[PDB]
Design a protein around this ligand. Structure first.
Ligand SMILES: [Mg+2]
Length: 256
């Protein structure tokens, strides 16, 4: 039995709903759909967006209205979900949803954008630190883990169109790239790069005219698994053709 998981930063759930979300969801038919940037309390959602036939949905909004938020649609519900690392400043921004599926924990994370200020870059880097502590604790306790979402950092030069121009911009700073190195070194695998070693493979493009059309993008969205679990991963790909956000979805197929 194969399990298909999709991750997608939708840049506002109500917005992507106007741009073909439900039609796409019905075509792709994943077992689990992880979303970032819902920008809505579930009460603000139309019924047909809240309840999609065949799926249980779980929403983790931020405390701040119209900001951040993650969600998960799943055919089979998890035994429970955890919505934080146990650190207040990281747990109130609707960034963390960790679903316990028994065979694995699924971390659906919307990692912070560090571009707007030094304080928010510090927040991003400390969030990275808290995340690594959390996943390591779970992995060390014997859990297999799948981590998906918007990491807001491109790992290597291959992972964005303009590496030189962005080496002093959050998203491609040496310190952020070093954190991704450290994460992987701790025993996790960037699943896309198990299967695809090509350039030009991005998950995000500015809305600035022509950016997406010129493939001036960044790979910001990833599926990671712990090393012990990588043998179960069959596919990891980018759904580059799917419109409606400044990010496109990414996919993982596993067989347990
Ligand atoms: Mg956005």
């Amino acid at each position: 039995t194969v399990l298909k998981i999709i991750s997608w930063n939708v840049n506002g759930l109500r917005a992507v709903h106007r741009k073909g979300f439900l039609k796409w969801f019905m075509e792709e038919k994943p077992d689990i759909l992880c979303l970032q940037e819902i920008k809505a309390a579930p009460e603000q959602l139309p019924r047909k967006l809240r309840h999609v036939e065949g799926y249980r949905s779980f929403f983790t909004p931020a405390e701040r209205k119209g900001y951040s938020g993650v969600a998960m649609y799943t055919k089979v519900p998890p035994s429970s979900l955890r919505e934080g690392f146990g650190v207040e400043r990281f747990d109130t921004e609707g960034r963390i949803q960790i679903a316990d599926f028994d065979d694995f924990l699924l971390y659906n994370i919307y990692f912070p954008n560090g571009k707007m200020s030094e304080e928010r870059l510090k927040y991003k880097l400390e969030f990275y630190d808290a995340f690594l502590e959390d996943v390591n604790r779970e992995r060390d306790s014997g859990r297999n883990v799948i981590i998906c979402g918007d990491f807001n950092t491109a790992h290597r030069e291959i992972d964005l169109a303009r590496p030189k121009e962005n080496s002093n911009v959050s998203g491609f700073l040496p310190v952020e790239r070093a954190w991704i190195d450290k994460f992987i070194e701790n025993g996790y695998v960037d699943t896309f790069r198990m299967f695809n070693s090509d350039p030009g493979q991005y998950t995000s493009w500015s809305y600035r005219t022509r950016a997406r059309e010129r493939n001036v993008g960044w790979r910001l969205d990833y599926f990671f698994v712990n090393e012990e679990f990588k043998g179960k991963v069959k596919r990891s790909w980018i759904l580059s053709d799917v419109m409606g956000s400044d990010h496109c979805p990414i996919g993982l197929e596993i067989e347990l």
